RNA sequence: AUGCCGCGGAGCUAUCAUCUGCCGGAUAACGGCUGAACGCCUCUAAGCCAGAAUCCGUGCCAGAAAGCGACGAUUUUUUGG
């Protein structure tokens, strides 16, 4: 369990950070979450533990699984699909904010502002679906959460959801 | 002992008259995201969102008579300063 760094990456280390650059951006997260000791061999982090609890065991796999994150966020996307379904459903809004209107013909108009670091670019490949795209997998699957929980129908036709995939 | 009756300005007064009465934050229940342990799964393990007439504020009333600031003039040619 020594993950290894790709080729233009600069992994930091200070005071439980990880702070991973790369050519699509720079992306960053806290990890003051786990009291097991980090080593920065130059080209692979290792994980030492001794004689470690229980919740040791989670604590490395937790660390472990984030730092994979970043590592594939360094010159990776994180594209979602959405799903639209239907009264037809319209979006229209700019930038990192998405709005939704005649949601089951309901008078009120929403509206989502998305994470820094994710972008919506109002896909038009196919019917009813906007891709969504960025680099931080908790932001990115974060706004698309929001989206999906703020288009709720009460009292009871039910609004589903598209895979997902990388980009780039 | 306001003698009695009509009207009676002013004032007082009427849900018998008229005017005026917000939006911010943190949450509960509960629901999602990144993610494990228990090599899978799963909102939880740290964390991040969302969230009620709840709670805490801004707003409204008082203003500490022993909380405080800015500013003005400083007994007038007697006498005091």
Same mark, same amino acid.
């Given at each position: 369990? *020594?993950?290894? !760094?790709?080729?233009?990456?600069?992994?930091? @280390?200070? $005071?439980?950070?990880?702070?991973?650059? =790369?050519?699509?951006?720079? +992306?960053?997260? %806290?990890?003051?979450? &786990?009291? /097991?000791?980090?080593?920065?061999? =130059?080209?692979?982090?290792?994980? @030492?533990?001794?004689? =470690?609890?229980?919740?040791?065991? $989670?604590?490395?796999? *937790?660390?472990?699984? @984030?730092?994979? #994150?970043?590592? !594939?966020?360094? *010159?990776?996307?994180?594209?979602?699909?959405?799903? +639209?379904?239907? /009264? #037809?459903? %319209?979006? *229209?809004?700019? =930038?990192?904010?998405?709005? @939704?209107? %005649?949601? +089951?013909?309901?008078?009120?108009?929403?509206?989502?502002?998305? +994470?820094?670091?994710?972008?919506?670019?109002?896909?038009?490949?196919?019917?009813?679906?906007? /891709?969504?795209?960025? %680099?931080?997998?908790?932001? &990115?699957?974060?706004? $698309?959460?929001? /989206?999906?929980?703020?288009?709720?129908?009460? #009292?009871?036709?039910?609004?589903?959801?598209?895979?997902?995939?990388?980009?780039?």
């Amino acid at each position: 369990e *020594t993950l290894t !760094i790709p080729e233009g990456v600069s992994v930091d @280390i200070k $005071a439980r950070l990880v702070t991973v650059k =790369g050519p699509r951006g720079v +992306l960053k997260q %806290n990890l003051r979450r &786990v009291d /097991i000791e980090l080593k920065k061999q =130059g080209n692979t982090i290792k994980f @030492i533990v001794w004689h =470690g609890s229980r919740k040791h065991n $989670a604590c490395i796999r *937790t660390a472990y699984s @984030i730092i994979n #994150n970043m590592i !594939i966020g360094v *010159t990776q996307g994180f594209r979602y699909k959405m799903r +639209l379904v239907y /009264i #037809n459903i %319209n979006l *229209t809004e700019n =930038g990192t904010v998405v709005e @939704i209107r %005649n949601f +089951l013909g309901e008078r009120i108009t929403r509206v989502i502002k998305c +994470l820094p670091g994710v972008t919506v670019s109002i896909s038009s490949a196919v019917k009813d679906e906007i /891709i969504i795209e960025g %680099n931080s997998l908790e932001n &990115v699957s974060q706004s $698309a959460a929001n /989206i999906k929980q703020i288009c709720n129908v009460r #009292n009871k036709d039910g609004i589903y959801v598209s895979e997902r995939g990388n980009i780039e």
